[model samples]
Target: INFDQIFEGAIEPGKEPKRLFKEVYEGAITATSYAEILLSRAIEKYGPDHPVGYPDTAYFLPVIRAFSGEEVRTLKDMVPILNRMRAQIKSELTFENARLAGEATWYAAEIIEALRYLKHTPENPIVVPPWTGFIGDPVVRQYGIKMVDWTIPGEAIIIGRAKDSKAAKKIVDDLMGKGLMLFLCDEIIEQLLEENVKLGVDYIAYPLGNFTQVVHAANYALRAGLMFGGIAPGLRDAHRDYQRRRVLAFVLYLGEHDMVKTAAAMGAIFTGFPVITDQPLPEDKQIKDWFISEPDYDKIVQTALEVRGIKITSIDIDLPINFGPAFEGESIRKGDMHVEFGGGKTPSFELVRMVGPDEIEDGKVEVIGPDIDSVEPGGRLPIGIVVDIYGRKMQEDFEPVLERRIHYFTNYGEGFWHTAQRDLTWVRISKEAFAKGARLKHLGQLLYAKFKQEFPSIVDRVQVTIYTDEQKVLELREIARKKYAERDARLRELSDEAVDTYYSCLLCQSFAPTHVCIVSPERVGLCGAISWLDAKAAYEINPNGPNQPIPKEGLIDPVKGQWESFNEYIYKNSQRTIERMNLYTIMEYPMTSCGCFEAIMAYLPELNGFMIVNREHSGMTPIGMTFSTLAGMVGGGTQTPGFMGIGKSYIGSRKFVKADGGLARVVWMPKDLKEQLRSIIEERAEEEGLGRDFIDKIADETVGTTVDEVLPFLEEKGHPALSMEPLL
Candidate 1:
């Protein structure tokens, strides 16, 4: 099958669907290329030494020979047939056969065909052939006790864990001739010790352990491996387990009981391992059952091998016995009460607590602490005394005192104020502290002492505020009603104005040297992470603001997402340099860079376009740029004033910026400035019509690079510093 033809047909419409297809196609191609390179390298380094004559020189030769037969003359001719065979084999077992088979088959066929053609044809010669049949060799057949060589001595021994006495006995019997140590679980170890087995165990394998224990074991193994040439094996939890077990060749249990898929999701393949899943093979299946049956798996493995030099191995069968729970049961138990914090949910013992003197006849409590004068009006307050009592005990022990000095509010002065302006406070206490036998009378006594010591003169002058559960609920309802009314009023005020508005986000501009954020009443920042209201509030807080407002008189199209007059304003303000400043396409358009862009641009050979990413994301990203360096170019006190000045001027007026064809395209900025702009360098690329997401993904992939690398990637992508001629 011709992938180019398939992809071209799929992406003819130039819509979002087409764009998505293009990304997938490009990623697949990249994976295929990587696999080819990796397989070639592995063969070249580990196979034979001779140049011409050999059993086989390529690493994949054995696979080709098994599927296509040894008599195949041309590698090109054998590729298609081998690919078909792979598909047929994978289809017999897996649901992914139809989806992934095509690519793998196609790749395999090409590889085989290439090998055959290279050997016979004058134009191409066979670079390598697979001859050493090591992949299919059984572990039992490869046992040999060889002494360590001085030049490249093996310094570590991997221990395997057994679930039962029977399984442990089998493992020991299989490894009898092999010069390696074995580790067993507690039960098996106890049994072995009782039997007086003399085999020296170097390390212990603790399967089905919790994350903390697994991490501790892994740390011990790493240190022990370095010190005494030892390694441990066990079942791991997920990526955390993989990371911890990096020093050991772990024995992962498979079958219905296994959690290998979870491990894969967490990128556990990074830890090199021959994952032995002990599920029983089907009754009629051959030895091929030991390998991956999914085509996607093949492609993924091939890509990983090429790009990351990681190899994933699998075995079929379940470990013999069951182990106890990985972690203590009590640790995972749920609490009775629940609470919501931030965006996530958490459990709590209770929401409210009661404490203090029962004879007071009031449910209020007063809390006095240092720095009360400096505390913000709306800020949370600490409780002076905690009460420990329940609803049933309320009648017997609860306080009902009318003149109790229990609650205090800073805004509760002599005069009545608007409810909106009045400060409302809630008390918080620890249930754990109350559970430790602390009582209400003790709490009241402590608060009384604190109030007298801290405010002796005003202690008796102030009236105590009484707060009950019913009173608390009523206060909350009133506060919410008033807040909504104020918010609605503010929104209505902003909506009454017909004139367009503008503002600058100097914070972003500081990083993306060429980037400028033009925030208006209608149009917000491109990232969608900030809004005009937010910007205005920030500006109000600091007049030499991170966001500065710009006056506007532009036509706005809510449906199409554009601005007319603002476009022209930006173009002229930018010296007629930016030719395509479309608000809708600002992310893909000529971005007004602030020096601290999250990602820098880099060219991806496979995709034939640029990618962006910061320094945290691993793998190969197209471009690299550092936040600090980019900041210098955009707004970090640079004479040219890269990002901030450009943004400020662009949002200054509607006369210079204009909208066209539903896109707010900047008509003018300066010819000289445009010439020096980074967008120009990418114009040729834009004309070629690469998918926006593809470019963005590449950028995102480099999220893990160093600031230094990011800076260079950005410069390479044609930032002003790289494209601009010296200002004479």
Candidate 2:
């Protein structure tokens, strides 16, 4: 089978490559020379062999470590490796030959960055360079499973700059809208960021640094094999073969292709990632599958998606305004609000109930409320969406899953804004949508089509009713709350020890490809998507799917939350990179984390405690680290001694750190996280025999973002952690 490597190519017959070869060849030598000089300097400073490499990973100079099976742990150890790449560059400029040059060039860049950050060397501590430096292994592990399963369907390296800023964002938005991870460097970062294109790790979009910094992209791919696939070093062909098979990635080049850019393209192709250039090229420059010339800007992203075989299936919305996931990021502010409902401005809620097929008429939509035309601009009204859904396979457990779909489905409407969920859900219908004749029934119609189209297996019929009257809205709101409360109470009563079998979630496996989430009755998946019942439904749905039932095979240790079957299952799913894991503890073999995890908890040895941070808590926490900083250190599916990623709800669990002093060790959290989890924390405190004062004892950014300040406050407040066993 052709893996569609057609877009990748060897060097074309040309004099143009001679200059590129010269530029590439020369830079390799120069960078190598600089690497050697730095190596000598490091050796002199820290004896004959000074230690080198990035943190939290076993690979050293990961490229050479992966390709040549050469592990460079010392400055002197890199001397031979640096010289080897130089010769590889000097040898030839053929496409594959040029890949050797690309390989060599990448090593040079890696060594240069190492010296820039290596301790006890010049610039002992790392300083931000003009370009993006290395992306750590944890970052790859964080997003590993998402990239694998195509949750982020593919990867694109956007090089150079677009002819116009509009073209840049258009390409980016098109790709990002399709859920593609993007790598950016050069002028494109500034260009797109100027256009207000949201670029961040959360978006699966990375802005790497300039020129040589492009090497980071190559290394990112190299580390992925070890981080996710467990393709060990020394199996060069197998490793390379694996990436070409599993990692669906390609490249897009805009603006100028200088000698460096051309050579960079060669490097990209060396890794089986193809490159598409938006330029009129000579016949020799065009390699059928490997290299292509496209002049039109309109279809660039389409071509990019097709080249990578990314088929994006979108929901069908017959609403008056445009509707799709692409329009989700566009917010409808109050400034444009023509009418609103359920945004905490009034009593409102939406509920989905599984009804007997006979009781639910297919596609029935009724508005027991004022129509869009009846409401003036900036108007607010009470409303409720009571959706009676009928499905042959659906059950009560699936109700919440379908209910949560309202926010995303409702938001798909172009002029619609939906936030929170259930009763707290706030929505705004833009004047444009209202002006375009968007009525309440239109929302029902879209969900009808979307549920049947996207979830054909579960939903055979869907009927919706919208309510705007005060009495009916308030009445239904009470009903929705009761239904929601029932589920919350049941989940609270469930525990890991109560079930005989557990389940695993592959939802985040793409980002943390080997990440195995063992969801018990007590704990939900860290992404907050898989509860025990959800996984149970998944098993019943696709018996051979990623979410599978694991017979709780053997008893190992209850305190550590370890079992023979759980260990064996997790290890196999983790690509054997991780041999064992624990579900309830943080200090030993904690559960693995994917980028989708809702929270991060890291141990602060200084205070003998762990502080938690949620993904949305962008500010600095009591551990003196921001959520972003801690996430990179905590994930990658390993026990990082003092850090782990988790679901925010886990904080309130009876099993949480049960063997490690439980909730008392929690030193700090984001203020918002604290408030959002207020009710649960209150219960945990009461259950733990601590007065409600335990709530006030916790520190947040408002208290102090550093351990120094937090410790003093904790002592002053007579916090429980002050008397607990050392978490150290």
Candidate 3:
């Protein structure tokens, strides 16, 4: 049936206006109630699971569900139902003990009761736990905490301490001395202090704490060294050298967002260190145990130190503890390795080196650098990289895709047509009949008086009206002014709210997995750069909106800088494809950068792991490739995934780096971006170091070839070292 004509008629006179007003008022109330209900449901579902009891859970679910409906459904359908059920049980228990649950539960209970009247249907068949028929399954009654499973192809270095004090100190000092920054909790720091040894470390980051604070501290330290003390003056040069050498290092802790990892990778292109960690440590035995038992802790530390040239260090554990017999036995096995509690592993050196510029070729120039297979993280694995070439292509392609049509209409006006014989007798009033240029009000009064004189019989029956009411004008103006002020106030409020809501959109996550966008009151999503309030307003304007909100529930702790809600939200939104997300931990899962992102950084395993490569160089980097391939990989053709999609593959994966050349590369450029090779050579010769003749010879050899070709010739002539340096 055609729904357009559904409201064609009114029930009674003036009924349309009455109906319209009533609908508008009721619709608003209904929408608000729905939002409240969604929030209440979240609290009921997550309160029991969060240890500290997240107060905002009741308000977060509706928004998240609205934004990430497909992801949630995917998680429910694809992953094991048991895991989902267990998570819910845990959340419910946590909520029961939470203090905020007192009010939240009441709200939730009321909303559930109200929802009974609404038609609720699940797209996938419900998977009931075995105990559901027995004593009322606890899983069914509990809220489900979504899980994310993200796997990066690399040997993860897990660092922790042993039970013995001397051994722990030795490990810490050795790792720190080798440039491995310590990932210690305050308690661990205290323990270290008791041991009386200052590691003289480059950085000391805490796990499971305020990521912003940690980043701030790190940035301060870096700036202090660079600007104040000249510590890292060669940082930019070192990064370029590292990329050329194919040597890279990334320091990241477990349970952090991938965006942080991506950022670390990108930072390696300039700063050389992409160290990441979870929240700052708290007083917890489990955290302590995990750090100590991590398998490859010593290896990671040793590798960081032993790796020549570029040194990349990452601290894994916060405390020291011995693995005892179980881990010791597993460590001895040839193939069997001790697995950490949270499924973290030390990245392999080969995998790190495998993804490098060596895989690419430039006309007759065979760059001798780290081979793909020799890298630590391994080549051919899917990963995401923000290359300038791809970014430019995506921007170009997006413009056409988002194009819309515009229509305009124009018509010429004609004076009213008149038939022939229209000159019938007509009375013409002279200017003398009224005062010169009399106002409309005065003229109307005079006309009334003249009418009474000319036709006394009809004048008695005629009604007199004033053309303009002077008194009414002032009153109407005042009313209009008040209306305008009220409208302006409402618009301002809505604008502010829109800005606040736009940041909460998780759209980019569908492409970039392990990336959590942190939208504060001021900051917006990096890709779209829109605030949370803007996103919300957009959603209101279009319910099936592009930018949707994430539910702030589950195990979120704003004060402690732990966001369980965000973790669960990203996991569910990403279709349970990503596991073990830590919202507050930028090192673990920060917002994903698109191919359109400003730059991309790749880990070089050959040189013992360093992040290298920015988007500036166009010659070597195939960033010119568009994101069309990446979009297709992330299901852009069918059901569009949000920002989480980027994490599904690696930057060097076949999908992104087409024909082996699409992988990120660092291309050297001429001295001047605009000048030709001949002009640049002539300019270089005027300097003291190079003679004009020699400069001309070198420029001719270097013309139309990759940087790799020109370096050897320069080295042979003893003019300047220009060899394809190995990046590890």
Candidate 1 lDDT over residue span 110-137, tens digit each: 3423332234432543322111111111
- Tell me the lDDT of model 3 at 680: 36
Q: Evaluate all candidate structures by whole-model CA lDDT and list the values in order.
A: 0.30, 0.75, 0.28
Name model 2 segments beyond 4 Å from true: 1-148, 151-316
lDDT for each residue of candidate 3 in 230-327, tens digit (9 for 90 to 100): 22233434323322222223343433223222222222212323332332332221111111112343453443333322323332211122111122
User: How well is each residue in 292-378 modelled by candidate 2, as lDDT tens digits?
Assistant: 667688877788777756666544455677876657856777788888887657888889888898898887899886867777678
Clash count, one per candidate: 99, 20, 128
Q: Which stretches of candidate 1 lie over 4 Å from their true place?
A: 1-499, 505-516, 521-530, 538-546, 553-591, 596-619, 624-728
Using lDDT, give the best candidate's number: 2
Q: Could you estimate the TM-score for every candidate?
A: 0.22, 0.63, 0.20
**lDDT pick, better of 1 and 2:** 2
Better of 1 and 3 by TM-score: 1
TM match of model 1 to true structure = 0.22
**Candidate 2 versus the native: TM-score?**
0.63
Name the candidate, 1 or 3, with the larger lDDT value: 1
- lDDT for model 2 comes to 0.75
